[PDB]
Structure formats: structure tokens, C-alpha cells
Design an enzyme around this catalytic site. Structure first.
Site, mmCIF file in Angstrom:
data_model
loop_
_atom_site.group_PDB
_atom_site.id
_atom_site.type_symbol
_atom_site.label_atom_id
_atom_site.label_comp_id
_atom_site.label_asym_id
_atom_site.label_seq_id
_atom_site.Cartn_x
_atom_site.Cartn_y
_atom_site.Cartn_z
ATOM 1 N N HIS C 252 8.316 -2.808 -5.443
ATOM 2 C CA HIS C 252 8.027 -1.700 -4.474
ATOM 3 C C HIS C 252 6.869 -0.822 -4.800
ATOM 4 O O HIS C 252 6.067 -0.526 -3.927
ATOM 5 C CB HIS C 252 9.274 -0.876 -4.152
ATOM 6 C CG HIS C 252 10.299 -1.628 -3.353
ATOM 7 N ND1 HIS C 252 11.287 -2.376 -3.935
ATOM 8 C CD2 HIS C 252 10.478 -1.751 -2.020
ATOM 9 C CE1 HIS C 252 12.016 -2.949 -2.996
ATOM 10 N NE2 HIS C 252 11.536 -2.590 -1.825
ATOM 11 N N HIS C 350 18.077 2.164 -3.754
ATOM 12 C CA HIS C 350 16.925 1.452 -3.290
ATOM 13 C C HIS C 350 15.717 2.365 -3.219
ATOM 14 O O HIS C 350 15.199 2.612 -2.155
ATOM 15 C CB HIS C 350 17.242 0.845 -1.940
ATOM 16 C CG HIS C 350 16.332 -0.244 -1.536
ATOM 17 N ND1 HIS C 350 16.750 -1.566 -1.491
ATOM 18 C CD2 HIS C 350 15.048 -0.233 -1.107
ATOM 19 C CE1 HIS C 350 15.747 -2.319 -1.072
ATOM 20 N NE2 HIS C 350 14.695 -1.542 -0.854
ATOM 21 N N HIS C 430 9.948 4.893 3.761
ATOM 22 C CA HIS C 430 9.052 4.460 2.734
ATOM 23 C C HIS C 430 7.921 5.386 2.513
ATOM 24 O O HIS C 430 7.735 6.349 3.250
ATOM 25 C CB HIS C 430 8.523 3.094 3.095
ATOM 26 C CG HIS C 430 9.580 2.049 3.170
ATOM 27 N ND1 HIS C 430 10.623 2.144 4.046
ATOM 28 C CD2 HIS C 430 9.778 0.885 2.464
ATOM 29 C CE1 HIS C 430 11.344 1.005 3.976
ATOM 30 N NE2 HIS C 430 10.995 0.358 2.866
#
Ligand SMILES: O=[N+]([O-])c1ccc(O)cc1
Ligand SMILES: O=[N+]([O-])c1ccc(O)cc1
Ligand SMILES: O=[N+]([O-])c1ccc(O)cc1
Lengths: 565, 565, 565
Positions: C252, C350, C430
Site C-alpha cells: 500500500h 487495513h 485512501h
């Protein structure tokens, strides 16, 4: 959560492109546990005149790949493939669309004409449309030769001097390996990274990929640098062996024998000369190795042949590695190395091909710089095919004697110029192989022909030549030739190959260095099949190097129906 | 210059310790271009009772190594080595002092007793002082099993759940590979880094090194995880093959046949079960591969034997495969993996040895969880040696019938318990091999004997057993046994091997897991040679694991005079 | 001899294509010992509408490459390049023709639409013709997830059962990495083999290449699997680091701080839970590492945040990894792994982005499944941006309070539905980064918006959103948004990024998963620059995946004038 595997394409499993990672124009139909037999693959021609590739697939192959191997795709294309098989007694068939990616040349610089080598179809006679040719060629790296073996310093060398180099480590180049069809389309590519890495300095991935030869299993062996290999047409690397520890620099040839051994051409590292200097010898040792990579036997040509014979060495063009045209002037003080010269540690022999004779367990060799010889298992010279000049006894007595078709002597001088005859020996030749006819085929390049240079360069020519040798009588007869009358546009100063093809009674040939000396122009590799009876050109296709003045090595006539046993 | 090579030691070249970097107790005398024959090497005993090691060296070995191979050195010692040869017709000899370095165990933690495995000589009869034994053992890694194959999510799995594991990738451990003499001294060491790297996560260097077996060349094959290998006593890795793409998890055995092929014991990756779930199967496929790594044949035992026969599977000690003594309770929902249970995807067979019968081109297999079977080239079961319980026909009809020395039936129940006889079947056995005598030898471990666990845990024993099989009559006779009287102290619940030795008429044996269950105690690997005629112990030597409760796998009786052909 | 190096192209040295072997659309003009300054490169547009790429080259770069770096070439093209410099006080210039080879996708199967991802230019406003976008995307491998970390077996697990898996090793995919211009032409390619090898099983070359971020040197960092990297636009790998031994699965994000450290997002391997089970945690640890790869600090989010909060976890689409549309039903017995769930060892957090705040030495994180948090160097939560539901004290007290432009509270329920307001929190967001404006920009994907699923799927939308946070007052103000009114064709359920661009006052954005759920169709990655003042689309370019239903990760707006300092 994970990512699932590709799902089945039709009635078997997924269709995987380039499963092994080394052959981007191949694919594999995964078996997904199906039990099948009588398998047949067809890759359909592209466009109107596209060549179809079709072949059966044996059980060993199905088991080895755990799938159906798809060979013959086009790059950057939605290939149309048909697979047929039997399963549960029923006839079965799938049609797949198999998209491929691009071929990449990883070795380009300002010399590059373009990324790939250009093909030019000249002639394809009816009945030769199906033919495939594997081209064993190469492309200069940007740095050039960057590495040398370290040798032993000379007693006549300066005190403060660093030690010298030895052997032939600089004999190193990027591979360019493809199959061309009769439309001039690339139908296979071996990824350059399979064996080679010119940007790293791992000598394990350096050298000059050569000696690509078919095995009894329809796979191929090859040599590069300090390793020898076996691979198949799916791009699977089946063997990778280091050379045994006493040998170095494997080039030009590898060939599997019926006994499961492989014949290789190498040099000897740390070879102790009579004056006590250690060298890596050049291109003058034959190994017989097994599939464990062990040494079954070794022929040391420096004790079998005559390393002092300069009859041909002194007649050669120095430009066959700036100084092209110029006849070579041998010097007594040429430093040891990959340099034209006499004696162990110099390039006195340059053996470039091997043929195994199962009839008497002997080897036939092509010595670029000495001629063609049979050497027995006993290490004794059985015969020599060469002009007679320079050969002292006991070797002189092994020279084959030219004869006509009635069996009567042909008169030739010591330079191999004959009288009232088409007979001529070979000069700086290649591929002295045993044909299926029972004769010796040679590619006669013709540099230093008749042991001199001609007045004019354009006066040189190459020949496809065949001989009938009677070992009992000690006679040789020229029984076929082609190319003398094609002039300078058929002249390959170096490399090249021929091989008789019995299936269609043709002489296959690849001239690898046509126009090598035309500074600034692509070099030409010419594929030919010549009708053995009529001498009519049945196939002619030219490959042009991707950089100027960049020779090709060899080519093979490959058969899909043998590829996957 | 730079740095010179090591200068010659005596009358040949330098003496190089561990030339290949994989065997520190080896050296090589460089040929330095000498031409020699009649080579013989003697490594002198250390101290008064030191065992001498002596052997001839063949031409292929001299050629392959470019030197004289020195085998049998002691660690960290000024070894006294004598090499004798003929050269130019003249008898020659050199005496060398070959200093060696230490043996290193790269895998130690708080469980370690000490760095090496201890030896204890129990018995060496006169005339057996020369015997050398290659021990195939292993040592735990600090992290243990760190990796799994990814399988396919089952329809009964949670919607949100990550996917499951499959196969046997966790069957991974550091090797500990040495040769021991009858003084208990280490006389050879295979560097753990040769094949294994437990600290990196390159699966190419993971697995469990097993199936060390001699080849017709005096070299050895082996398996570790996803590769198979060939190596020699100089530590030269001669072959390294990836498993064909359809297969995984090679364990327990590798054996070269007279046909130049190698038989392997693997699993099938992406095996599609009848219910459409894909698994990597466990220890239930046999490959025949060539030296190109290609598949010549495969036996899928899930379609050949019966993966639902739980007659033995349900009778097993949970502790083998500290829940020791506990009889395995099979479950219908045991998740696929290296787990006791029925069906493709579980450890229903655990095949652990292979033998090739060149008389009828068949394979004999030891299934730990079912018995011993011959399967033909034709994939048909030819016979079964096992208790009759659980076998359905067609297979029941293949069970061999126990007979006495006069060929009269012996009476046994379905659990294999026989009446009024020394005859007994094998249970969780190993190394079902063909002896030089034309019999079938087996290591009868004895877990789940007579298809149950006994009243109390220590009521277990192992046997060296040999049978005579009449395949036409379908009969089996037990013709030799040993160890049944030695009790639990001679009980190897797992691993182990026997092999008849014709030369001194002994039965060789290695019980690999004596006292496996003694929490906190080293595990005993017991090397034995038992006089075939008298049952007298000629050799008994114990190896003790370097961490507690750490099994050994196998050992071999090795013969230096075969090592360098 | 040898082979000479490529000769000089013009007035400097040779022009080498892809000098490092990882960037086939780059070249290098060798300096050949020339001393130069004020260097400028221009790659000319191809055709009528072709985009020119022009940039200066700093001294560090000349020295590092020992040459002039040429970036921006077209594939399979005779590129026209102009290089200008000063030398000996004189102005100098060369024009080169730089031939390139092809881009290759090494990962194709029956799912492949074609080899490369298709681009579609939708809008390019005047003054945005020069823009370049680096696309961080991926392409499914043929086998899918093939490997798992081995975990610790459960006390509630079956006796015979093999051990379970843990962590996220299956989070593994082939990279597809390119720069696109405003004509939709590929102007850069990172060879897939640079970092990845999906055909081998060396975990060192596995994972999911992500977190490509610019460094202060105009180079980039990235993470893949168990390694983190630094590379430049010539394809030179400048750093390759293993993760420190206690951590695993880096995904990520990677970002270099002003202090020369790099912030990474990982899991903890062998993390001991309170019940004594060891797991590899999922996506819930932040490392700060130096350029030695050592650990400068670690944030363990399982002790900082609340791993039991399921307010958002229970509202999510289970189809954001078959079961698309379906709201996720958390289960108390979800096996540990990369699975939606609460607690250490499950995917509770996450975390998918990191931003370093140099003002207070803190980190801002995006937790897909919890919201956006600032965590101090002291490991204390400083603020939370999230709907208030599920947050217990002490964390509840850190929640930011919505306000209008006058500073007055906005009323919202515990699900983040506000009244009489454009204000909305972010959901499964995000790239929570700090803009050059002094505000927090987020890509608000919008799955589980308002902590539920809507009646209809098409009712979902994504937003580019910006907030002004006052940490002293504890208030948050929405100051800009875009995309809500673009509907389902602008909805990215996963991945994606925004970043404010001050040079032209635009909001750059990349929506990475538009149409992810349209089974059988390419997935759409949409590049946008949106005028910050007018909200007019200045750039819009769509990238279409090369296989169906294959998400993209991120994209970057890259600037040639920064590439070679
Ligand atoms: O210069 N060359 O490239 C050569 C020269 C000779 C040879 O045998 C092969 C290649
Ligand atoms: O536990 N073990 O190491 C074992 C178990 C079974 C086997 O067949 C070999 C080794
Ligand atoms: O399924 N996927 O490919 C994903 C899902 C989530 C994520 O954050 C990245 C990739």
C-alpha cells in the site's frame, strides 16, 4: 481471499502463455487432470498467405508439461489455435484464441538499425511452404568484450608488469534466437535472458551461444561460455552444466551421441606447456560428457595433430577475427591468447564442428585452420582431408587421396589446386558432418583457398560440398558441389552450415556472413534449400543483422512433428 | 601480477582442499597436465586405533576432476595422505599432509545439546573395522515450518475466510549429512548449504533431503522439496532438476534404474478431485524421469490402490505420522493436507520407498499406511503384501498368501495375526527392496501392528524381515527376521532402512527413531550389521541427535572403492 | 581480438539503450570522459500531435550515470532526441536517432484481452498537454495465489489436522508499470522482472508492488512483499532491503520523510496474542526505517487503536477482497488470516496510506476499516476522522467535530449522516495526505457509506474530498469535494488516490476500480485533473485492465524536470 488461477479455456484447463518464461511465442493448455491421447495441435496461418503449423504431441510431453504444448505463435497477435484429442473414447476439439506479447531485443545502442533482424523472402518453391528454420544468431552488446582470463606471467615479461591474459573469455555476445517461416515471419523466440546476461558480471551467464543441435528426444543442446545446456521448444531448460573443472571456453558445437553422451568443443585451462608456462588453450580439445556432466573422455588435439603446421594459418585473411583483405603475417612472439598463431595457447586449430561415427566409435572434426580429420577412440588420426602442404609424417601418411568417379587419382599440387578436375579440398570450413546418404558434407567457406589470398577480394567464393570417402582404400571423391558460381554475394568468410535433407532431397544451407566486409551494412545470413538433383533453388530467405557487420553463426531446419515426443 | 595459484605439493599439482566448496573433508590433487594411471589413495588412521581409508581412482574420475580425489579426511587435522600412481611406465608415490578445517552446524538454538551429533560405538566384530556409513539425518530449524502451498477454498468454508493450505510444503528441515567410521569418527561432511538454506525464503532451497541412493556411477541421487539432485563424494552437484510442473513435494526416495531413468516419490499439484476441488496430493505419485528432467512415466496411486481403505490408518499412533500412545481417530472432515485420513488430498498412502524390478519392468512400493505392492508398467496391481482387512476386490484377489518352508498355508486372521508361525506381515514399514539374493527385504517398523495399538505403549517392536515371493503361485514365505526380541529399545516408530550385504553376508540396518518419544532425550539412530547365518551382531553404532526428539531418516553402507570410477 | 564497445554517437560517447536493463524506453549518452554542464534533453513528439518531453539533467545525475539520461522514448520507434550542453565554455548540441524495442507483458493466459492495457483519452484542456502520469497497476498471474505463511495450530483445531496459514502471503500479483502521456502513448516502462518473478518460488521476488512515492532526490520508493526498494527513472535499483526480521507483508505505501527515514506499512510476524496464539498480523503496523534498513520506530496499531470496533467492518461489501453486493456478516470464528474480522490476526484495520507531519513529528494514517487517525511519536492517538459509532472512550474523545465555514457545529448521527450540510466523513478511503495548501486530502471511495449498504449498488459514489482540521479546537471542516454527482461510472470501490497540484491549481485523482463488478469487462482506471476553482475537468484519461475485473492501485503525476537532479 487469494487470487484464483486462470480458469479453464474450453474443455481442458487454462491456456498459459510462455509457461516456463523463456519462450514468449509458446503457450500451454493445462491438462487439469484430464486423461487424453492422440493429441494434435494446429496454429493457423495469419492472413491470406500465413503458414499453418501443425504437429502431434506424444504422451511423454503431455506428462512432462502436464498439458498440451502450443508452438508456432505470432508475436503481438490474437493467434487462432485448434487442439484435437481423444478422451473416454470420444473425439474432442477446442479452438482457442491465444493472445501473445512482443519480442524484445535487450541489446541496443547507436549501431542498431532497428530492434529486430529483418527477413527477406527470395524464393519458396511449391512444396516448401511449410518449412521452419531456427536461426542461431547474435547481437553486439554495448560494452563489447569486458572480461579476460588471467594467465601466467612470462619470464621474458617486464618485472613491474601486471600478469597477462589467456584463453578466450572475450568471445562473448548477446544471443538472437528465432524460428522463421517461409513468409519471413518469426514463429518462435528464445528470450535472451534464458542463458545470457550481458549487463551483470556473472560469468555463468556469459559467452557465445552456439552448437544448437537436436537430440534423439526432439530437444536441443547448446553451449555458452563455461556451461552447456539442453532445452526444448517450450523454452524449458532441461540441463544446465558447468564445464568440468579442467576446461573452459565451450563454443561452436554440442552434439548428443546414441550412447547418451554429449560431444563438446572446449579449451584446457591451466594447460602446462613444455616450457612450463600455463595457458588456457584455444579451441583444441574435445570432451565427451555424460548427463551428469562428468568426463567420459577427452581428446587433446595438441598431442594428436600438429600445432606447428602453418600452411593454412599463414594464408588467412586477418580481418576474419580493421585489417580486412590483408593476408596474415604470423609472428614468433604473438602473445598467448585468442590470436592466429601456432602452438598450444594460440588459435592454431580452431575446431568448429564435431561428428560422431557410431560405426567405429570415432569423431570427425572440422579444423578451420588445418582441415578435416577423423580421430579414433584410441586417439590416433585415422584420416585427413586437407591440402598436403605442411603435413609432416607420420600425419602426411593419413592424407586422403583424391579420385574421380572411376576411381583414378586426381593430380593436385601441395596447395590443393587440382588439374582437369572439379575436385577441390575445403578451406576454413565448417560443419563436417555425416549425412543420411553415407557421405561427408562440408560448408567450404573458402578463405585462404589454395593456401593463398587472391589478387582481388571479390574473387573469393563458398561451396556446399559433399565427399564419398573410402577409408580402406584411403581415397576421397567429390560427389556434389554448389555455390562456386554464385560469386561474392554467396561468400561467407566465416561461420555457416550445410546439412543434407532426405525427406525432399535437398541440400539445406545457411551462409552466415555474406557481405561481412561491407562496412556499415547489415550482414546477410542466407537460408537455402537446393534441390540435390537439379540444383534448383527451392528456398532462399535472407536474414539481415540488426547492427552492421555482425555475423550470424548457424541455422537449423526444424520439424514440429519431432518437437514434442 | 596478482596472486599465484597454489604451487605443486609433490610430483603432481597443488593439493586443494574442498575444491567444489561442498565437502570440507575432501581434497584434490591437481593433475597439472601429468598423464597418470593405476591411481590409489590411502588416508591414514588418526591415532592408534584410527581407521585407514583406501581406494583406487578410475580414469573417468581423474578426467572429470582433473586430479586425484582425496576422500576420508578428519576434521581439523593434519591428515596423512598417500597417493600412488604410474607415470611414463614408472611407479610413483607422494605423501601429503592435508590440513582440514571444522565441520559447522548452521542450525542451532536453545534446544541444541551441542553442535554435532554424538556417536557411541557399541560393537565392532573383527573384520568389520573398515566399514563406513553415510548417515542421512537432519536438524531442526529455529523457525520451524514457515511455509504452505495455497489450495482451493472449499464450498463449506466461511464466506469471509482466507483460502486454505494444501500439500506438504511444511515438510522442511535442515540436513545433517556425514559418514561415520567404526571408531565413531566423522570421515565426510556434506555442507548444509549445498542444497539447503533455511534462513532465506527461496523454496528452491527448502525441503527435506532424503532418498540418498547410489547410482551405477558410484554417485548419488537425492530429493529435497521441489528438486531432485545427483552428487558425488567430492561434493560435486552433478544434477539439479526442478520437478516437472505437474508435481510437488518429492520425499523419501530416489533411485536410478538400469535404463538411465530415476524413480521419484511426489505429490500431484492441482489434482482435480471428483468433487471438483483442487488439491496437492500427499505422497501418492510415482514419477519416472530422465536425466533431462522429463517425465517418462507416472503412476497415479489414487487410481491404482484404494484411498479409502482405513484398516491400517485407523490403527495408528497419533504421535508418529506428545499425543503419543494415542490411537488415531479418523474424521470425515479432516481438512486436506499432510494429515492422516482417507482420500486424494490426505495422507492415505504415505509411500516411502521404491524398488524397480527389471525382470518385468515393474515397481515395488512401500506404502506406510496400506502395505507393500507391486504395480506393473501397465498400472495394474500385480501383488499386495498386507493383512487382508479392508481390501475390496479387485484388489483383495492380489493379496499374497502366507506359506511355510514346505509351501503349506499359514493361518492368519484379517489383522495379520498368524497361528502357530513366526510369519508376520509388515506394519508402517520402510525400504521394501530387492536383495542380491532375490528376496524382498523390509524394515518392519511395527506401529499399528496387527491393526491395533497395544495394551500399553512400550509393547512395540521393529523387525528386519526378508520374504521369498512366488508370484505365479501368489504366495509369500518369511525366510528371515531379527529384532522382535529386542523390544521397545530397538523400536523405530518411523523412518529406517535395511539392506542385505552379500560381501560379508550381513543384514545391514539403521533404526532411525529409537527413543523418539522419550521427552527431552536425544533420538537414537542405530547402525547395525547382523550376521545373516548366526544372527550375531557384527556392528552396532549409535548416533544421537543434536536436539531432543529429532528423528534420523536413513543411512547407507558406503564403499570407497566404488566412489570414484 | 575482442568485440569493441559501441562507438561514440556524436560528440560525446555511445548512446546505450536501457543501460540498467530494467527500463526499455530509456537510454544513456555515455560521457566518454567529457566534462560538461548545463545539460538539457528533448525527446521529440511522435507524429503531428506527439508530446515532447524535455528536462534538465543535474551534475549528480551526470556523475551517477556517467552519462546523459534519456527518458521519454516510444516503444518500437526511431526516437528523435536532442541533447544540449556546455563544454569548454562553448554551446554544444547533438541529435540522435534512438531506436527502441518492444514492451512485453510476461503474464498472459486465456483471460487476456490483449498484451497491454488500453488507454482512452477523454479530455485534455489547453495547457495540460505536457502532463505525464505513472500508472501503478497489475496483471493476474496464471497460477494465482500459490503460497501461504504457516501459522500456529489452534487448541480448538482437530488433532490430526495440519497447521493453519496466517498473514497475507497470497497478496501477490505481477506488476504493470508505465507512464502515459496526454495522447495515451506509453512513454516509460518498468520491466516486470525488475522486482517480480511469478514463475519461480523465491519469495524475495513475490508480492504486490505498491506505494510508489517520490523522494527528495526525484527518485522513488516502493514496497513488494517482504522487501522495500528505491529506484530512479533510468530503471536503476538504488535500494533493496529485506523487511526487518519481526515484520512481514509490506503493502500500500512507502514514503520518505525529511529526516532520511522511510515510513512503511507492514504486519508483525510471530505476534503473540493474549490467548497465547502466534499470528502474522494484517496491515496494522507502521515502521520507520532508515537507509540501512534498520528500525527507527514502530507503531503497533493493535495497542493504539481499537481492534474490536466493527461499526464499519460489519457494513462492508464482501465482494471487495463471487459474493459481491452482499453486506459482510462478521463471524466470531473467522480463522486468522487476510479475512474481514476484528482482532489481531484479522483484517480489522487495513491501513493503506501514511503521511508524515513534520510539524509535530506525527503520522496520519488511513484505515480503510476504521477511518483516518493522527498518531503521535508518543504512540498516542491525537485525532480521529470517522463516524462516531463504535468508538469507546478513551478514543471517542479524540473524534474531530464537524463545523461549517463560520465555525459552528454540524449535526450528524452516529453513522456520519449529517443534516442540512454537504459535510460527510470518508468511508473505506485512501491516500489521507497533507496537501501543499495545508489541508488533508482524501480519496473517499464510499463503500459502507453512512455505515450501511444502499438499496441499490448503483447508488454508491466516490469523492475527492479536502478538510481543514484545527487540532487545537478539535474541529474538522469540509472545504472541497468532487465526484458525488458523477455516479456509478466514477465509483471506485477500492484502491485509488488524490493529490493537490499547486502548479496549475488542480486536484489530481486516479480512480482505480471503476466498473470492477461488471463481470467480464476490463476494469477502468481514471486519471483526472480537476480545476480546483471551477471544478472543470482539465484532464481525463482512462486505462483499461488487460484482463477482466483486475483492479488498478494508484497513479502519480510525474515531472521530468525533477527526475534527474
Ligand atoms: O568475429 N566473429 O564473430 C567470429 C569469428 C570467428 C568465429 O568462428 C565466430 C565468430
Ligand atoms: O516426522 N518426520 O520427520 C517424518 C515423518 C514421517 C516420515 O515418513 C518421515 C519423517
Ligand atoms: O482485491 N484486490 O485486488 C485488492 C483488494 C483490496 C486492496 O486494498 C487491494 C487490492
Amino acid at each position: 481471499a487469494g487470487f484464483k488461477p486462470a480458469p479453464p479455456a474450453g474443455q481442458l484447463g487454462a491456456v498459459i502463455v510462455d509457461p516456463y518464461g523463456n519462450a514468449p511465442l509458446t503457450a500451454l493448455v493445462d491438462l487439469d487432470s484430464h486423461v487424453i491421447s492422440d493429441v494434435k495441435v494446429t496454429v493457423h496461418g495469419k492472413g491470406e498467405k500465413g503458414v499453418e503449423i501443425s504437429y502431434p504431441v506424444g504422451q511423454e510431453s503431455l506428462k512432462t508439461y502436464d498439458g498440451v504444448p502450443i508452438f508456432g505463435l505470432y508475436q503481438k497477435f490474437a493467434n487462432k489455435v485448434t487442439v484435437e484429442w481423444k478422451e473416454n473414447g470420444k473425439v474432442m476439439k477446442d479452438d482457442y484464441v491465444v493472445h501473445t506479447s512482443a519480442i524484445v531485443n535487450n541489446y541496443m545502442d547507436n549501431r542498431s538499425i532497428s530492434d529486430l533482424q529483418q527477413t527477406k523472402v527470395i524464393k519458396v518453391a511449391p512444396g516448401f511452404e511449410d518449412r521452419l528454420y531456427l536461426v542461431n544468431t547474435h547481437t553486439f552488446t554495448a560494452q563489447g568484450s569486458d572480461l579476460h582470463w588471467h594467465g601466467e606471467k612470462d619470464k621474458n615479461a617486464g618485472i613491474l608488469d601486471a600478469g597477462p591474459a589467456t584463453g578466450a573469455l572475450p568471445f562473448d555476445i548477446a544471443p538472437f534466437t528465432f524460428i522463421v517461416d517461409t513468409e519471413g515471419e518469426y514463429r518462435w523466440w528464445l528470450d535472451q535472458d534464458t542463458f545470457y546476461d550481458g549487463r551483470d558480471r556473472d560469468i555463468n551467464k556469459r559467452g557465445y551461444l552456439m552448437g544448437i543441435r537436436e537430440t534423439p528426444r526432439g530437444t536441443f543442446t547448446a553451449v555458452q561460455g563455461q556451461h552447456w545446456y539442453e532445452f526444448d521448444m517450450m523454452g524449458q531448460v532441461l540441463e544446465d552444466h558447468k564445464l568440468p573443472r579442467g576446461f573452459a571456453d565451450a563454443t561452436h558445437e554440442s552434439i548428443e551421441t546414441p550412447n547418451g553422451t554429449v560431444l563438446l568443443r572446449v579449451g584446457k585451462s591451466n594447460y602446462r606447456r613444455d616450457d612450463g608456462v600455463h595457458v588456457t588453450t584455444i579451441r583444441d580439445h574435445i570432451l565427451e560428457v555424460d548427463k551428469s556432466g562428468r568426463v567420459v573422455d577427452v581428446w587433446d588435439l595438441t598431442k594428436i595433430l600438429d600445432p606447428k603446421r602453418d600452411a593454412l594459418l599463414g594464408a588467412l585473411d586477418a580481418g576474419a577475427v580493421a585489417h580486412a583483405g590483408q593476408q596474415a603475417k604470423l609472428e614468433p612472439d604473438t602473445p598467448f591468447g585468442d590470436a592466429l598463431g601456432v602452438g598450444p595457447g594460440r588459435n592454431w586449430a580452431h575446431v568448429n564442428s564435431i561428428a560422431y561415427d557410431a560405426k567405429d566409435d570415432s569423431i570427425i572434426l572440422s579444423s578451420r585452420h588445418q582441415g578435416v580429420v577423423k580421430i579414433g577412440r584410441d586417439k590416433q588420426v585415422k584420416w585427413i582431408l586437407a591440402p598436403s602442404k605442411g603435413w609432416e609424417k607420420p600425419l602426411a601418411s593419413k592424407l586422403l587421396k583424391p579420385v574421380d568417379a572411376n576411381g583414378k587419382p586426381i593430380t593436385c599440387n601441395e596447395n590443393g589446386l587440382c588439374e582437369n578436375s572439379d575436385f577441390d579440398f575445403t578451406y576454413t570450413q565448417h560443419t563436417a558432418w555425416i549425412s543420411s546418404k553415407g557421405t561427408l558434407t562440408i560448408f567450404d567457406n573458402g578463405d585462404g583457398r589454395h593456401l593463398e589470398q587472391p589478387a582481388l577480394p571479390t574473387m573469393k567464393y563458398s561451396r556446399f560440398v559433399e565427399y564419398k570417402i573410402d577409408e580402406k582404400k584411403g581415397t576421397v571423391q567429390q560427389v556434389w558441389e554448389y555455390g562456386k558460381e554464385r560469386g561474392y554475394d554467396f561468400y561467407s568468410p566465416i561461420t555457416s552450415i550445410i546439412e543434407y535433407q532426405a525427406d525432399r532431397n535437398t541440400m539445406f544451407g545457411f551462409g552466415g556472413s555474406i557481405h561481412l566486409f561491407d562496412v556499415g551494412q547489415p550482414t546477410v545470413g542466407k537460408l537455402n534449400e537446393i534441390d540435390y538433383k537439379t540444383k534448383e533453388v527451392k528456398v532462399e530467405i535472407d536474414v539481415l543483422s540488426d547492427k552492421p557487420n555482425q555475423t550470424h553463426y548457424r541455422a537449423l531446419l526444424v520439424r514440429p512433428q519431432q518437437m514434442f515426443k
